[PDB]
Structure formats: structure tokens, C-alpha cells
Amino acid sequence: GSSGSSGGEEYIALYPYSSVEPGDLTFTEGEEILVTQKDGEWWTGSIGDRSGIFPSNYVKPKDSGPSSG
């Protein structure tokens, strides 16, 4: 019954992190980073279809109210 679509962990960038290196994922505060791989402290996030590393200390758990109706 029903079909809920999910994937990775939805996190919000608490602060805008700009990396000069194409290795670290570049995003701004508020952006929605989809975490999938967590290696140590720094986890690998994604955006739409991007990939890179970022400070896990610069991301929060996308908290959304239990929308109902």
C-alpha cells in the first residue's frame, strides 16, 4: 500500500561552504545536500546529480513537520 520515495539523507547546509577544490562539494546555506556515504567525520553529499565531500559539521538533518492534509 502506498509508495513513498526516499534516498540518502537529506541535510541542510547550516553555512555556505565554498571549496576552491572540485573535490569538496560546493554549496550554500539552505541548500539541500543528499548524503549517502559517510566516511569518518566528513561525509559525501550530493545535489541533484553532483558529488563531493563536505564538513558534516556544516550540515543539519532536514527536519520536516508531519504534514497531514
Side-chain angles (χ1 to χ4, degrees):
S2 185
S3 249
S5 213
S6 238
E9 294 193 34
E10 290 99 66
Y11 267 87
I12 310 275
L14 291 154
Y15 313 97
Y17 182 78
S18 35
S19 28
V20 303
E21 292 269 72
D24 239 274
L25 194 73
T26 56
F27 52 78
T28 40
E29 162 253 65
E31 271 270 312
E32 251 180 270
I33 299 129
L34 188 63
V35 181
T36 67
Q37 260 146 357
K38 309 198 213 69
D39 240 288
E41 190 146 322
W42 288 50
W43 314 332
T44 283
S46 317
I47 295 163
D49 285 278
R50 260 172 253 199
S51 247
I53 61 161
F54 72 79
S56 68
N57 200 22
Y58 283 57
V59 306
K60 82 191 202 217
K62 157 137 262 295
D63 217 337
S64 188
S67 60
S68 226

